[PDB]
C-alpha cells in the first residue's frame, strides 16, 4: 500500500519562472546623450556668464 507519504497536489503546482527576467529598462541611449549635452550646455551658460561677471568684479576692485 501507500499512505501518509507526501504527494503533489491533484491540481498540480503553478508554472514557475525559469527564463531570463531581463527588462531592457531605461531610455534610448540617444536620450541619455541629448540629456547629457543639455545638462552640460546649461552648466556652461551658468559658468561662463559667471566668469565674465567675476571679470567685471575684478575690474571694479
Amino acid at each position: 500500500p501507500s499512505v501518509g507519504q507526501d504527494l503533489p497536489p491533484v491540481g498540480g503546482y503553478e508554472p514557475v519562472q525559469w527564463r531570463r527576467n531581463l527588462p531592457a529598462r531605461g531610455f534610448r541611449p540617444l536620450v541619455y546623450l541629448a540629456a547629457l549635452c543639455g545638462i552640460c550646455g546649461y552648466g556652461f551658460y551658468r559658468a561662463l556668464g559667471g566668469i565674465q561677471e567675476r571679470r567685471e568684479l575684478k575690474r571694479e576692485k
Partner: protein, 76 residues
C-alpha cells in the same frame, strides 16, 4: 572580423567603421578636432552676432600724456 578597409580607400566609410569598432580613438579625436576648427570659425560670428569683446583691464596706473598744468589748492 573587423580588420581594416584603409583610410585611403573610402574615407567616410572608414570613419563609420572606426566609429563602430574603435570609438576610443575616434571619439577622443572628434572632441579634439572640434576644438580648433570651432575656435577658428565661431569667433568672427560671436563678434558679429552675439556680442563684442570686453574693454581691456588696466595693468598699472594708466599714465596720460600731458604737461603738468598749474593745479592749485592745499598749499597750506
Amino acid at each position: 572580423i573587423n580588420a581594416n578597409p584603409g583610410f585611403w580607400n573610402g574615407p567616410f566609410r572608414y570613419l563609420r567603421w572606426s566609429a563602430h569598432n574603435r570609438p576610443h580613438l575616434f571619439f577622443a579625436f572628434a572632441i579634439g578636432i572640434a576644438g580648433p576648427v570651432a575656435a577658428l570659425t565661431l569667433t568672427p560670428l560671436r563678434r558679429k552676432y552675439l556680442y563684442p569683446d570686453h574693454s581691456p583691464l588696466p595693468q598699472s596706473y594708466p599714465l596720460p600724456q600731458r604737461a603738468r598744468e598749474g593745479l592749485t589748492g592745499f598749499d597750506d
